[PDB]
Design a protein around this ligand. Structure first.
Ligand SMILES: [Mg+2]
Ligand SMILES: [Mg+2]
Ligand SMILES: [Mg+2]
Ligand SMILES: [Mg+2]
Ligand SMILES: [Mg+2]
Ligand SMILES: [Mg+2]
Ligand SMILES: [Mg+2]
Ligand SMILES: [Mg+2]
Lengths: 258, 167, 216
RNA sequence: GGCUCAGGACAACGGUUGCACCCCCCGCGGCGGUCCUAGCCGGACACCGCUGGCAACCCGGCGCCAAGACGUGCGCGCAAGGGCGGGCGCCCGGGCGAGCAGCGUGACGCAGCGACGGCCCGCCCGGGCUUCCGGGGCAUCACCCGGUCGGCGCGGUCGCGGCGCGCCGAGGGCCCGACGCCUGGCGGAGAAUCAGGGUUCGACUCCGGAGAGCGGGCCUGCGAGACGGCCCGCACAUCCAAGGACGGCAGCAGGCGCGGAACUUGCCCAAUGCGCGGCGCGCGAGGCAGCGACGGGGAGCGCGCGAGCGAGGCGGGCCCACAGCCCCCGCCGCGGAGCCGAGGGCAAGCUGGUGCCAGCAGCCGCGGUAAUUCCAGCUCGGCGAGCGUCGCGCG
C-alpha cells in the first residue's frame, strides 16, 4: 500500500481513447484535479501537441501556455496537464480558432469548430441538489461548479445553459420522454437519439431506452445520458449526426479513402 | 502501540489466522481520559491532534454543566455534587468518575431560585425544596470536553430511586 | 591537561577578553557554583578584585557544553527536543540523544563563560560600537505612534556607495489605497449577497423556506 | 519514483456491492456578516563580529538587525456538543427505495479568520473498512475453539465493530473435510505445449500486496507506525591523540562468499515524465553507448567461359546532447563451415590395426582372428552459422 496519493502514470495504464503510442515512452501525462476527472477528460498538451501539432515537445507547449495563448471557458490556463472535458469551449484568438469539445461516434474527443454567437455559453448536467451552510439551496454539475439559489423548477439530471461571462442560468431542459440526448459513457459514446422509455429498479440503476434517427435502438444507464435540447440540438455537432457504422461500412469507407 | 485491528484475533471457527504485516497508524488507540469530578486544582481540559488535523479535546477535571428540565422547559448551569449510580461498575461511582450515562446529584439553587411557585410535577418540586436533584449525563467527556445532561422524569426516575433507596 | 581558559564579556561596552588559569586551589571558591550565580572577583585579586561576575556557561575537558537544570558535576545523556540548546536539528521533528556536562561547576571544566554585572570604580582593559542600524519604522521613530506624515530621514551611513536599510512598517498611498479597496470590495460582496437573499425570499411566495435568521 | 518476494494458505488477490458507520493536500467552482496604535503593534533567533572548548563528531558565551516567521489583535454573533419540536393499521418537498437533512427555541462555550483576509462548502484523485462468488496439499491430522459465540453498558477510534473493559447467557465450526501440520507458497492479467477435451508453470515489463539485518516504539506532517527520518535491545562492523564517536546497497556501478548458472566502479537530461519555478535547475527515474552465440529475423562463401558484386581500408555527407551504428557519395578492393553419424529403430559402406583386452552402446546388442558396431584413412548422409550433451515441463 502506497503511503500517499499517486503522482505518476504509466503509458500502458492510460485510457485507451487517448490514443497514445506504445513506444512513445514509459510515462504519460498525469492530469491534475479540476473540472473533470481522470477517465472523463484529456490533458491540454495532448490536444495542443499530438492533434493540432502547434508544438512538437513538452517545453514548447509550456512556453505557449505560460505566454497566455489559450482560453478555456474565458479564462487563461497555464497548466499543461489541465483537464479538458465534454462540452468545453476551446478558443485561440491568435488564429481565430474556436472549438467545442465533443465525442465522436467511435468514442473519442473531437474539436467541433463553432461561431461567435454560441460561444458565450455552455451546457451543464445537474446531478446533485443539496443544502449548504445556513440551509441555503445549492446545485452542482458535471464540470465541478456550484450555483446558489437555483429555480425550484430545476431537478436532478436536467441540463442547464449558463453564460460563460456570468455563471447565470438562462433556460433549462427537463429530463423527459421525447427529448434528444447524447450518450457520454460506455459502449455507446457519441450516439445521439431520442428517449423512448424509462424503467427504474428500487435500490439499483435506472435504465434508459433510446432510439436513433434511423430506427436503431440501444440501452444505457442514466449516469451517462446527456440532454442537448428539446427535440433539436442546441449546439453545433460533428459532421456526422451520431450514427455508428458497422464494420463492413467502415471498411468500405477505408478502402474508398485508400 | 494500542491498536484495534482485527488481525490479532481468532476466526469464527476459533482458529489462529496468522499475521502478514506490521502495525499501522490508522488502527491506533489511546489511553482513556478517566475524567474526574473535582468535588493547582481546577478545570483542566487537554487537546488532541487527530487524523486529518482535526482537534479533539478530553476533559480531565471539571465541576459544572448545563442541565435541562424538559417537561417545564427550564435549563440552567449547575454544579455537580457527586456520582451516585452507574450501571457498568460500582468502582467508577466510588472514584466519582464522569462518563455518559452516569447518574449524578446537582445543586438545586439555580432551579429553586425561580421554582416552587408554579404547578408542575410533584416529585421534581420535592427535590427542588431540598439540596440536590437527581439527573443524568448525556454528553461524552473525553471526546468533546463537556458534561451535560437532563433531569430525570418518570419511569426511569422510579427505577433509579428504587435502585438507590435501600443503600 | 590541568587548566581553564576563562572568557570575560562586557555587555555594557561590548568588550570581551580571555585569561589563563593554571591552578584550582585559588579557584576553590569557584567550585560548587551554578550557572546564573554571582561570583565575586576576589579569586583573582590582582586586576579583578572588588568585582561581581555571573557564570553563564563553559565547556568540559572533552568539549561537552553545560546544561542548566541538570544539577550535577558529571556529564550525562538526555533526549533533546527541537529548538533546545546544544542541538542542531535536520528535519522538523527530529530528536537526538547526546552527552552534556552538568550545570554544577567543578574541576573537570576547561573553559568558563562569565559576565560582569557590578564593578568597582577602577578602570579595566575590558564603548559599544554598532554594526547595523534600526530598520523598522517604530524603532527609528523612537530614535530620531499615530504619526500622520510617515516621512523620515536618510543620512544613514556611507561606504563610494551610500547604503541604508530600507524602512519597514511604513504606510503610504499604495497600502492605504489597497486597504480601502479591500474594504469596499468586502462591503460590495456582502451587499450583493444580501440582495440575492432578499430577492430569493421575495420569490418562493408559493412555497416554504428554511434559513438561519440573522440575529442582532 | 526505483529494488526484491523473506513473511503470510476462509488471509493476500480477482470480479461484484456499500458507508443512511468514514478521512482527504494540490487543483476547479462557490461562499465570504464574528458577543464582551488600525497612516500600521510587541519581543526574539538565524547568518554575521569578538572571545573559546575538543583527536574527531560536535557545539558554548556576549553583542546591534528583517519577515508572507512567532505572539497580541481593530470586527454586523458565531465553531463542536447537548434538551425540546411528526403520526394512530399501511401506501398514494431539499432529497431518498428507505424519518434522512435543514430550521426554530431553552441553556452552555467563546474554538477558527483578521498589521498586505481566509475560516467554511461542493467536486476530483487517493485511502480505510465492508456484502456476494472464487481462492494449495496431507485423514499414518477426527473432532476443534473458551474473547472462543451472542446480548447489555461504557470507553477508544476518522469511523462501524469482542476493538478493549465490566456484567449476563451459553454458544459457534465439522466427511459439502473443521482443527492441526507441510510447502525449495506472493497473487492476478498471462506463458509453454497442441486435433477436441486438457497438463504444467506463473522471480521478472501492467495492476495489487508486503519488506528494507531481526524484534519493537515515535516525532513532523493532509498523508509515514517512514528507515538514502529519530529511540532501545540483540547479532555484526568502523575511527580513537582510549576519554568518546559512528553505520545499514533486497537504489545504480563495483567487490567477497555461494553456486551448474549470470555484464562497465562509462556519458547526458536533448527526448517521456516528476518536483520547484515565468524565458530555467535537478533527477543512476529515464535515455545513449560498452560486454553479450539466452534467444529471434534477414543475406552470403559464386554465376559463367566474362564480366560483375561483396566484406575490409582511406576520405566526404546524414544522424547524434558529444560520438559511434544504419544509409548515401568517391579511391583502393582478404571469397573463410562446422557439429554429429554410417547394424536396426533411423537417411547414409573400403583398407590397416587390436583380439571378450582396450573400448562402443539412450534399447536390442558388438568385441574370444573379415569386428558392416572399437581405434584410424577413403567415401557417404543430416542440419547448417550453427551442431551436439545433461536436467526439467508438454506431447
Ligand atoms: Mg470581539
Ligand atoms: Mg501575523
Ligand atoms: Mg516464501
Ligand atoms: Mg509492482
Ligand atoms: Mg515500508
Ligand atoms: Mg521503520
Ligand atoms: Mg540504503
Ligand atoms: Mg524512501
Amino acid at each position: 500500500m502506497a503511503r500517499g496519493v499517486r503522482k505518476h502514470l504509466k503509458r500502458l495504464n492510460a485510457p485507451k481513447h487517448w490514443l497514445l503510442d506504445k513506444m512513445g515512452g514509459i510515462w504519460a501525462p498525469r492530469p491534475t484535479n479540476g473540472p473533470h476527472g481522470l477517465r472523463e477528460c484529456i490533458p491540454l498538451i495532448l490536444i495542443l501537441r499530438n492533434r493540432l501539432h502547434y508544438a512538437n515537445t513538452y517545453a514548447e507547449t509550456s512556453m505557449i501556455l505560460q505566454d497566455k495563448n489559450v482560453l478555456i471557458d474565458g479564462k487563461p490556463r497555464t497548466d499543461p496537464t489541465f483537464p479538458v472535458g465534454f462540452m468545453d469551449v476551446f478558443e485561440i484568438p491568435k488564429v481565430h480558432k474556436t472549438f467545442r469539445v465533443l465525442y465522436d461516434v467511435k468514442g473519442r474527443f473531437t474539436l467541433v469548430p463553432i461561431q461567435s454567437n454560441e460561444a458565450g455559453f455552455k451546457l451543464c448536467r445537474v446531478q446533485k441538489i443539496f443544502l449548504g451552510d445556513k440551509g441555503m439551496p445549492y446545485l452542482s454539475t458535471h464540470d465541478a461548479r456550484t450555483i446558489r439559489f437555483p429555480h425550484p423548477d430545476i431537478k436532478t439530471n436536467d441540463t442547464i445553459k449558463i453564460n460563460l461571462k456570468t455563471g447565470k442560468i438562462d433556460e433549462w431542459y427537463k429530463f423527459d420522454i421525447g427529448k434528444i440526448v447524447m450518450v457520454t459513457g460506455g459502449r455507446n459514446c457519441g450516439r445521439i437519439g431520442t428517449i423512448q422509455a424509462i424503467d427504474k429498479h428500487m435500490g439499483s440503476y435506472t435504465m434508459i431506452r433510446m432510439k436513433d434517427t434511423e430506427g436503431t435502438e440501444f440501452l444505457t444507464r442514466l449516469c451517462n445520458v446527456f440532454v442537448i435540447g428539446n427535440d433539436s440540438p442546441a449546439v453545433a455537432i460533428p459532421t456526422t449526426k451520431g450514427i455508428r457504422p458497422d464494420i463492413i461500412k467502415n471498411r468500405e469507407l477505408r478502402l474508398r479513402s485508400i | 502501540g494500542i491498536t484495534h485491528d482485527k488481525m490479532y484475533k481468532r476466526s469464527k471457527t476459533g482458529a489462529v489466522q496468522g499475521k502478514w504485516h506490521k502495525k499501522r497508524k490508522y488502527n491506533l488507540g489511546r489511553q482513556p481520559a478517566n475524567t474526574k469530578l473535582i468535588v493547582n486544582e481546577g478545570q483542566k481540559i487537554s487537546t488532541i491532534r487527530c487524523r486529518g488535523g482535526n482537534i479533539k479535546r478530553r476533559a480531565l477535571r471539571l465541576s459544572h454543566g448545563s442541565f435541562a428540565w424538559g417537561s417545564a422547559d427550564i435549563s440552567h448551569k449547575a454544579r455537580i455534587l457527586q456520582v451516585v449510580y452507574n450501571s457498568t461498575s460500582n468502582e467508577l461511582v466510588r472514584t466519582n468518575t464522569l462518563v455518559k450515562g452516569c447518574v449524578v446529584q446537582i445543586d438545586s439553587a439555580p432551579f429553586k431560585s425561580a421554582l416552587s411557585n408554579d404547578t408542575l410535577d410533584k416529585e421534581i418540586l420535592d427535590q427542588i425544596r431540598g439540596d440536590h436533584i437527581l439527573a443524568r449525563i448525556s454528553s461524552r467527556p473525553g471526546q468533546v470536553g463537556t458534561a451535560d445532561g437532563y433531569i430525570l422524569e418518570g419511569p426511569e426516575l422510579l427505577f433509579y430511586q428504587k435502585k438507590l433507596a435501600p443503600k | 591537561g590541568s587548566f581553564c581558559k576563562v572568557n570575560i564579556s562586557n555587555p555594557v561596552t561590548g568588550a570581551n577578553k580571555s585569561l589563563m588559569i593554571e591552578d584550582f586551589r585559588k579557584s576553590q571558591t569557584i567550585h560548587g557554583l551554578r550557572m546564573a550565580s554571582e561570583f565575586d572577583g576576589a579569586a583573582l585579586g590582582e586586576e579583578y578584585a572588588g568585582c561581581t561576575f555571573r557564570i553563564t556557561g563553559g565547556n568540559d575537558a572533552q568539549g561537552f557544553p553545560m546544561y542548566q537544570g541538570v544539577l550535577k558535576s558529571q556529564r550525562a545523556r538526555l533526549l533533546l527536543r527541537q529548538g533546545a540548546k546544544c542541538y542542531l536539528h535536520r528535519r522538523n521533528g527530529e530528536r537526538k540523544r547526546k552527552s552534556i556536562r552538568g550545570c554544577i561547576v567543578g574541576p573537570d571544566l576547561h573553559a568558563l563563560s562569565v559576565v560582569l554585572v557590578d564593578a568597582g570604580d577602577k578602570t579595566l582593559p575590558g564603548v559599544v560600537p554598532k554594526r547595523l542600524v534600526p530598520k523598522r519604522a517604530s524603532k527609528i521613530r523612537r530614535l530620531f505612534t499615530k504619526v500622520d506624515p510617515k516621512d523620515q530621514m536618510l543620512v544613514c551611513e556611507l561606504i563610494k556607495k551610500l547604503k541604508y536599510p530600507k524602512v519597514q512598517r511604513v504606510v503610504t498611498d499604495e497600502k492605504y489605497a489597497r486597504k480601502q479597496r479591500v474594504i469596499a470590495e468586502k462591503k460590495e460582496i456582502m451587499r450583493k449577497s444580501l440582495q440575492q437573499l432578499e430577492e430569493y425570499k421575495a420569490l418562493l411566495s408559493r412555497m416554504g423556506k428554511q434559513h438561519n435568521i440573522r440575529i442582532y
